Every structure is written in structure tokens, then in C-alpha cells.
Amino acid sequence: SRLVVVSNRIAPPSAGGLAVGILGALKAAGGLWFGWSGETGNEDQPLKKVKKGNITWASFNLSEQDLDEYYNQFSNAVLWPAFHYRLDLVQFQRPAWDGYLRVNALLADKLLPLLQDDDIIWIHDYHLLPFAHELRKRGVNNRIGFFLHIPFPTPEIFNALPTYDTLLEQLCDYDLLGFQTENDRLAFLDCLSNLTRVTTRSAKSHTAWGKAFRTEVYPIGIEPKEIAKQAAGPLPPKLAQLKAELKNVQNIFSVERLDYSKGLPERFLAYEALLEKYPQHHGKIRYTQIAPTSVQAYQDIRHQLENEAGRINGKYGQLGWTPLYYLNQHFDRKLLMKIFRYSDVGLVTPLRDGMNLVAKEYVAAQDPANPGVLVLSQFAGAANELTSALIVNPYDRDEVAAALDRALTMSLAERISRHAEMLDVIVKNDINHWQECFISDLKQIVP
Amino acid sequence: SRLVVVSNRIAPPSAGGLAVGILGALKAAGGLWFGWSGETGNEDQPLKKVKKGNITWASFNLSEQDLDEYYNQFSNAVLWPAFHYRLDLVQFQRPAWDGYLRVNALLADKLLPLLQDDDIIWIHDYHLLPFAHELRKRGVNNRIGFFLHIPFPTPEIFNALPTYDTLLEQLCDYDLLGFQTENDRLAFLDCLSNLTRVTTRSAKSHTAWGKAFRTEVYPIGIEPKEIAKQAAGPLPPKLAQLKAELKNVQNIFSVERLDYSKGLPERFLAYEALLEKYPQHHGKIRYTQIAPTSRGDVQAYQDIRHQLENEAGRINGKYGQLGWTPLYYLNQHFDRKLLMKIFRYSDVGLVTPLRDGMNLVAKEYVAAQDPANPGVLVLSQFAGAANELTSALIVNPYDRDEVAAALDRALTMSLAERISRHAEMLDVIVKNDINHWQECFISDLKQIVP
Numbered sequence: 001s002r003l004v005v006v007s008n009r010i011a012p013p014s015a016g017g018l019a020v021g022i023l024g025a026l027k028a029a030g031g032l033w034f035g036w037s038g039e040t041g042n043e044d045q046p047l048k049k050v051k052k053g054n055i056t057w058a059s060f061n062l063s064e065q066d067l068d069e070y071y072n073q074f075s076n077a078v079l080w081p082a083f084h085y086r087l088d089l090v091q092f093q094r095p096a097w098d099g100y101l102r103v104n105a106l107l108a109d110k111l112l113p114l115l116q117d118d119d120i121i122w123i124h125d126y127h128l129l130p131f132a133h134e135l136r137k138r139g140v141n142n143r144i145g146f147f148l149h150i151p152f153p154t155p156e157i158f159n160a161l162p163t164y165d166t167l168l169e170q171l172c173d174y175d176l177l178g179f180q181t182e183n184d185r186l187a188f189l190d191c192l193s194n195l196t197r198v199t200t201r202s203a204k205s206h207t208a209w210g211k212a213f214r215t216e217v218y219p220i221g222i223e224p225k226e227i228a229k230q231a232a233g234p235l236p237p238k239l240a241q242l243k244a245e246l247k248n249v250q251n252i253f254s255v256e257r258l259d260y261s262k263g264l265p266e267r268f269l270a271y272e273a274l275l276e277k278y279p280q281h282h283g284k285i286r287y288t289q290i291a292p293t294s295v296q297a298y299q300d301i302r303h304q305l306e307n308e309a310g311r312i313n314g315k316y317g318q319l320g321w322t323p324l325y326y327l328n329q330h331f332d333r334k335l336l337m338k339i340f341r342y343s344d345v346g347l348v349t350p351l352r353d354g355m356n357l358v359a360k361e362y363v364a365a366q367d368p369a370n371p372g373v374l375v376l377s378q379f380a381g382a383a384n385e386l387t388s389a390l391i392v393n394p395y396d397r398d399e400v401a402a403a404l405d406r407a408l409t410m411s412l413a414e415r416i417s418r419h420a421e422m423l424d425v426i427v428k429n430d431i432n433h434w435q436e437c438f439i440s441d442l443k444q445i446v447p
Numbered sequence: 448s449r450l451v452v453v454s455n456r457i458a459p460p461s462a463g464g465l466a467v468g469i470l471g472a473l474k475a476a477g478g479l480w481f482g483w484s485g486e487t488g489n490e491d492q493p494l495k496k497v498k499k500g501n502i503t504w505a506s507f508n509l510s511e512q513d514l515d516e517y518y519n520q521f522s523n524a525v526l527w528p529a530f531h532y533r534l535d536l537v538q539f540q541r542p543a544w545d546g547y548l549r550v551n552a553l554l555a556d557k558l559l560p561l562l563q564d565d566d567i568i569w570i571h572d573y574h575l576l577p578f579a580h581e582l583r584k585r586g587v588n589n590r591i592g593f594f595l596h597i598p599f600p601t602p603e604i605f606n607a608l609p610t611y612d613t614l615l616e617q618l619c620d621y622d623l624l625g626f627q628t629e630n631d632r633l634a635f636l637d638c639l640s641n642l643t644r645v646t647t648r649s650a651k652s653h654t655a656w657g658k659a660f661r662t663e664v665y666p667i668g669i670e671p672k673e674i675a676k677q678a679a680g681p682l683p684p685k686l687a688q689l690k691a692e693l694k695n696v697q698n699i700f701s702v703e704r705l706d707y708s709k710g711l712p713e714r715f716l717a718y719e720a721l722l723e724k725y726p727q728h729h730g731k732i733r734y735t736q737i738a739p740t741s742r743g744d745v746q747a748y749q750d751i752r753h754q755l756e757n758e759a760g761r762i763n764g765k766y767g768q769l770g771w772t773p774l775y776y777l778n779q780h781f782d783r784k785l786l787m788k789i790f791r792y793s794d795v796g797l798v799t800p801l802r803d804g805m806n807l808v809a810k811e812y813v814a815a816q817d818p819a820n821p822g823v824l825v826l827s828q829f830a831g832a833a834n835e836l837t838s839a840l841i842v843n844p845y846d847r848d849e850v851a852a853a854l855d856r857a858l859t860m861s862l863a864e865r866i867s868r869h870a871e872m873l874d875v876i877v878k879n880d881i882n883h884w885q886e887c888f889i890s891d892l893k894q895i896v897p
Binding site: 239242245246288303305306307308309313314315317318320322325326327328329339 | 685686688689692693735738753755756757758759760761763764765767768769770772775776777778779789
């Protein structure tokens with residue numbers, strides 16, 4: 001009954017999505033959240049532990065050597081590019097792999113004293129693929145679940161990983177494997193079937209190497225009521241009536257962190273295609289891209305976007321109208337929801353994404369009586385449930401431009417029908433439904 | 448008395464500065480304007496001559512190899528970077544020098560049939576340094592004057608040129624050498640005296656290798672009442688609409704060709720210094736930089752464009768707001784009459800090159816202002832115009848905080864001081880206009896005794 005959640009980082013005591021589902025789950029049956037605390041260079045202090053009623057937060061530190069091999073190298077320079085279909089950015093070196101295993105084993109040993117024979121164990125992202133295997137080696141027979149938040153790549157990409165067979169064997173030490181989308185789940189079952197013979201009943205009960213495990217799809221959601229609440233309050237004063245400076249302007253908006261998977265250079269090119277082929281919008285629209293920086297792997301993306309902002313404004317700008325507002329600034333989350341609400345078009349076009357929550361935040365932030373339009377990549381995991389969005393292939397910049405123009409001229413009637421139907425999807429499958437389905441499936445496993 | 452003008456390009460059929468000066472000079476006693484037509488191929492075809500009364504425009508074409516060795520390589524990749532104190536951009540190769548010498552001799556041969564014994568000959572920029580020498584080799588004893596439009600570099604820069612000694616010898620075949628500034632003239636005399644014994648009398652009469660020549664300063668000017676006429680006209684429809692949108696914003700303005708000498712990345716960094724150190728201006732000012740498209744597609748100048756695009760993106764990314772973009776960079780052509788109006792309505796004109804013979808944008812800006820309510824000129828001390836525009840706000844562009852402090856001073860300057868500074872610059876520009884410039888040079892050229 002008691003729940004042990006292990007994630008790459010814990011939250012001190014809402015302000016996000018996955019934190020709400022993990023905390024909603026930990027209050028439902030009590031338990032422990034175990035995770036990295038954020039700091040480095042002093043590892044051997046005892047377990048930082050904070051207790052509040054039903055739940056205990058347990059955290060640790062990491063040496064600089066472990067963090068770079070495990071987290072900066074293997075997790076973020078091998079697994080992350082590969083799972084987002086970018087083998088050309090994979091930098092595999094065997095020391096990083098060995099360090100990835102060493103950190104996973106080291107946190108299995110920190111957690112082992114805190115476990116009880118009855119706990120169900122919930123492990124989160126790709127940083128901790130080997131964690132179950134490390135716990136089984138210590139005799140942990142509990143019900144263990146894994147949830148992958150990013151895509152799982154198809155075999156011809158995944159098997160190019162030098163340690164792909166070890167990764168696959170360790171994934172099968174979990175009793176339950178969760179995925180954002182059905183394509184991710186089937187991708188993993190294909191990679192496994194290329195490596196070993198797999199038995200499947202119903203659709204989601206499996207055996208490989210004699211190990212029994214289930215797979216399932218649990219698309220992660222948001223809490224829509226809180227987004228609507230932050231979105232409908234009034235603005236900062238200086239920002240209160242820039243809504244009032246720009247009454248004559250339609251705003252296309254997007255907010256994304258800088259990453260190769262998000263395809264931000266291609267959005268700029270889609271916006272340039274809109275300016276080149278629909279000149280009737282000149283002086284009457286604006287594209288605003290907010291892209292905070294938080295790693296030198298990501299500055300070459302930042303350099304390219306600065307260049308493309310300058311080039312596009314240089315080419316289509318006027319003495320009194322600049323087409324593209326690019327902001328490399330941090331905005332507080334409660335202001336972004338208001339910007340979502342007042343933006344006529346939300347543009348969410350990553351090249352590969354496990355689940356884009358910005359897309360759901362944008363829909364949950366709209367005024368239902370006068371909502372904006374969501375333009376969504378078909379490679380966003382959210383595209384499988386947000387079918388009434390304007391779905392686009394970001395590799396076709398004219399098709400995205402055509403969707404932007406359609407979004408900018410769409411009648412209120414069709415805006416309401418599309419928004420109401422996406423909102424129903426998001427409300428029915430919210431963050432709280434997500435954690436309940438996963439905990440309910442995890443409990444009913446037999447050890 | 449009849450005047451022969453040779454320059455690399457000619458104006459066939461005034462919306463310009465030097466075109467207005469050369470044409471005023473030609474119309475005074477008639478004459479000939481001889482130059483390249485701008486076109487490659489069919490170089491052996493006859494001279495295209497157009498005559499209008501007293502004046503003849505005669506042009507030629509060049510072979511594609513002549514354009515590349517003479518103009519793209521030696522003129523624009525050896526002499527231009529070196530004369531702008533950028534030895535690191537010199538790409539000297541001996542075929543380029545030989546093509547530089549071959550084209551000069553080749554245009555001297557094309558021009559020789561057109562000359563008469565009494566003509567005064569006026570040769571213009573750095574493309575034609577050897578031209579006097581080529582005419583003297585063909586026995587031309589006329590009065591020949593040269594005007595250099597760009598700076599003349601100090602000896603430690605000029606002497607790095609592999610052919611610096613031949614260039615100096617041929618310059619001494621002109622009877623009169625004109626320069627933008629006294630520093631250019633003196634730099635040339637330093638280069639010459641470092642190479643050979645030079646005699647100087649009064650201030651500007653010289654001998655070298657037994658050749659006699661004069662030197663003099665003729666800062667090039669503008670036509671102020673034509674600038675003022677274009678500036679005060681009414682706006683085009685879509686640009687009329689937005690002087691009504693630019694009511695609560697002060698505009699800092701600049702318009703320059705893309706070129707390493709102009710220091711456009713350093714202007715951007717000066718603007719970033721203003722935004723970083725005078726936050727009181729946020730949301731209330733704007734810097735607009737117009738950087739036209741270049742005909743010649745000069746690959747060297749597109750690295751500059753890439754650099755500006757990046758810095759425009761970076762500076763707006765860092766200081767922009769959801770409702771305010773600090774920096775408008777436009778890589779577009781704006782018609783010249785519209786620029787004059789933009790000048791007039793701009794609170795601050797920013798002209799800060801790293802090295803410039805004479806920046807005429809500086810004079811156009813002040814000639815464009817409404818005298819009863821003028822904007823402020825911020826000017827680099829390395830612009831040749833800084834020697835006569837002393838009441839501008841003179842700045843050193845290598846100190847970006849000093850440029851920012853001048854911009855902040857320009858944006859908050861009272862009306863009385865703006866009128867005082869502007870009135871004194873306008874007087875300088877009206878007294879030394881483009882027509883005064885060509886009259887001073889031809890009058891000095893004429894009184895030379897062959």
C-alpha cells in the first residue's frame with residue numbers, strides 16, 4: 001500500500017504538472033519521495049529528510065564526477081538525443097555508461113534501507129532506466145513501476161545505441177512499464193522482440209527472458225482548474241494594458257525551452273513562410289517566442305534563433321512594425337497563462353516530443369467564450385488526444401504557414417467547437433486521473 | 448579650361464553628393480566624364496558616348512577578369528582595407544596588382560584620343576592611383592589633379608603594402624593631390640618622406656624624385672537646400688500613418704552600407720550599453736539601423752550582415768519586452784527622399800564609423816533637421832567630418848560606455864542646446880557645400896603651371 005516514488009529530483013514542499021501528480025499520489029496512500037536534491041560536491045552527508053504528515057521527502061547529493069558522466073553525459077548526451085531520433089547528436093563513451101550504472105546502483109543502495117516488503121515503487125524518467133534491475137539484485141521483490149516521459153525510439157534508432165541490449169534487459173525487471181503514447185509502447189515492444197522472443201496476451205501482458213511484466217499507456221495531463229484560475233486574474237500593471245497597446249494586433253505565441261527536439265528554427269521558417277505568402281497579415285500580426293536559457297549543448301540553438309530573428313525582422317520588418325518578438329527571458333508561470341489566454345494562436349510544433357504540456361496549458365488557459373487556436377505538431381504526443389487542434393507536419397513550412405493563416409482567420413463558432421472538444425479531453429484525463437490509473441495498475445500486479 | 452573627369456563609375460543621365468559636385472564642375476566650362484559603365488563583357492566594343500550640349504559621358508566595359516583583378520581584388524581587397532587601417536583584411540596576390548596596373552594603362556589608352564592639349568584632368572578615387580603615371584608615359588603634360596575619397600594611412604600601415612613604393616612614385620605624377628582631411632594629407636607626406644627626400648615650401652608645395660606637385664585639403668560636402676527640400680516633404684501613405692504611431696518614442700537612427708570600416712557591430716554594442724546602463728530609457732526609445740542590400744553581393748560584407756542579424760536578435764532577446772522591441776534592424780532599400788524625412792523626425796543621428804574618409808550621412812542628417820527643433824548628431828572622432836562638425840557629440844567608438852553616455856546626453860538635451868549645436872554645424876555645411884568643394888579644387892587645378 002505505501003508508495004515509494006523515485007525521480008531524478010524532488011520538490012521541496014500549484015507550480016507545475018508532474019509535481020502535482022506525484023504529490024497527489026503520495027497523499028492518497030502515504031509514502032516516500034526519494035530524489036536528487038540539486039547540489040554537488042558533498043555526497044557523504046546523511047540523507048536530507050523532511051517529513052510532513054502523510055509523506056516524507058528524502059534527498060541526496062552527487063559528486064561532480066558522477067553528475068557529468070551519469071547526467072550530463074549518458075542521460076543527456078546519449079539517451080536523450082537517441083530517444084528524440086537524433087543519433088547524429090549521440091556522444092557515447094564507455095566511461096559515461098559505467099558512470100550511469102554506478103549512480104543508479106549508488107541510489108539503489110541509499111534507498112534500500114528505507115524500503116518495506118509491501119511498498120509499491122514508482123520510478124520516473126530515463127535517468128533511472130537501470131534502477132529496478134539494481135533493486136532486484138538487492139533482493140527487492142516489490143511491485144515496481146516505470147514511467148517514461150520522453151518518446152521511446154523505433155528499433156533502427158534504438159539498436160544503434162552501443163548498450164541497447166543491456167538497457168532492454170533491465171527494463172524488463174520492472175513489473176509495469178508506462179508510456180506517454182501507444183507508439184512509444186509499441187516501439188519498446190518492437191525493440192525487445194528484435195532482441196529476444198516475447199510472449200504477449202491480451203495486448204499488454206508480456207514475458208521475455210522468463211520475466212513477466214506489463215506495459216500500458218498513460219498520457220500525462222495538467223490540472224485544468226488551476227490553469228484557468230491563474231489565467232483569468234488581472235495582469236501586472238505595466239503589462240495590464242499592453243494588452244491595451246496591441247488591440248489591432250493578432251498574437252501568435254509559443255513558449256518552449258531551447259532544445260533540438262523542439263524545432264524552434266523551423267517555426268521561425270514557418271513564420272517567414274507566413275509573411276512571404278500571406279502579405280495581407282503584414283503590420284497586423286506578431287509572433288512572440290519566449291525561450292528561456294537554463295548547458296552549452298543548447299546555446300548553438302540559441303545562436304541560430306537570434307540569427308533568424310534578426311534575419312526575418314531585417315527582411316519583413318517595417319519602420320513601425322516588427323514581425324517577430326524573440327525573448328530569451330524567464331517569465332513567471334502565472335503570467336504565461338495570462339499571455340496564453342490573450343494570444344490568438346498557440347503554436348506548439350516540436351519535431352519530437354513525448355508529451356507537450358504547453359499545448360494543454362494553452363487550451364486550459366483560454367476564455368471558453370472566446371478561445372484561441374492551437375496549432376500542433378503531429379509529432380507531439382499530445383496530438384493523439386488533441387485531435388481538434390490544427391495538426392501540422394513541421395517539416396512542411398508552407399503547411400504550418402497555411403495552418404497559421406487558417407488559425408488567424410477562424411470564426412468564433414469553429415474556435416469554440418475546437419476548443420470545447422480539446423478542453424473535454426484535457427478535463428477528463430487530467431493529472432489526477434493519470435496518477436490514479438498508474439497506481440491502480442501498479443497495485444494489482446502480483447509479486 | 449575644358450574639364451575631363453575620370454572616376455571608376457559615371458552617372459549617365461540630383462539625388463547624390465559627388466555626382467552633384469562632378470556635374471557642377473563639368474557644367475562650368477563643359478567637358479568629358481569618362482568611366483566604367485558598370486558592366487562586364489563586350490569590352491572591345493566602342494566607347495558608348497552620350498552628349499548633352501557641353502558635356503560628354505563616355506563609358507566602357509571591362510572583361511570579367513579585369514573586373515576581378517583590378518576592382519574586386521586589388522582596389523577593394525588590398526587598397527581599401529589597408530587605407531582603412533585593416534592590414535588583416537589585405538589579400539595581396541601579384542596577379543591582382545598586375546591587373547590593377549593593366550586596367551589603369553588600358554583606360555589611359557582609351558582616354559588618350561579624347562584629350563586635348565589645354566584640358567584640365569581630375570582623377571578620383573583609389574581605383575586610379577597609377578593613372579597620372581600612365582598618362583605621363585604617353586606624354587600627357589596637362590594639369591592633372593587627384594582626389595582621394597577615403598583616408599590615407601599612416602606609414603606603419605601603408606608600408607606593409609608589397610607595392611607601396613610604386614604607388615607613392617606614381618602619385619607624384621599628379622600636379623595636385625587633394626585629400627579629405629589634413630591628417631590624410633600629412634599621412635601621405637609621411638609615407639613619401641619615409642621613402643624619399645621631399646622638399647616642402649609654404650605648406651603645400653613639394654618635390655620628390657625631381658617631380659613638383661601640390662597637396663591640399665578639400666572636405667567633400669553636400670547640397671543643403673536639396674536635402675532640406677526632400678526632408679520637409681510629406682510622407683508616403685503607409686509611412687505617413689506611423690509618424691502618428693512614433694509619438695512617445697525617441698528614435699536613434701543610422702543608415703550605412705555594410706563595410707568593416709563602419710563598425711556596425713560596435714554601434715549595436717553601444718546601444719546595448721545604453722540599455723544596460725540607462726534603464727530609465729526602457730520602453731521609451733528605439734534604435735533603427737538601415738543596412739541596404741548590396742548590389743555587388745560582396746562575400747566579405749555578408750559576414751557583417753550575419754553578425755548584425757545575430758546581435759539584433761541577441762539584444763532584442765535580452766532587453767525586449769512583450770510590447771517593446773529596442774532595436775529595429777532593416778536590411779532593405781529605402782528611397783533616398785524617404786531617408787531624408789526619417790532623418791528629420793529622428794531625435795538622434797548616430798554616425799560612428801571606425802575609420803571614414805568623410806561620412807556624408809553626418810552632414811545630410813544635420814541638413815535634414817528642422818532648424819527650429821533639431822535632433823542631435825553623435826559622431827565618431829574617426830569620421831573625417833569630425834574635423835569640421837566640432838559641435839556634434841564626438842565619441843570614441845572603441846569605448847562603448849562613452850558612446851552610450853553620448854546617446855543618453857543626446858536623448859535628454861534641451862531645445863536651446865540642440866538649436867545651438869545644430870545651428871553651428873549647419874553653418875559649416877552651408878559654407879562648405881559640394882559646389883564650394885569642386886570650385887576650390889578646379890581653381891587650384893587651373894592655376895597650376897604645366
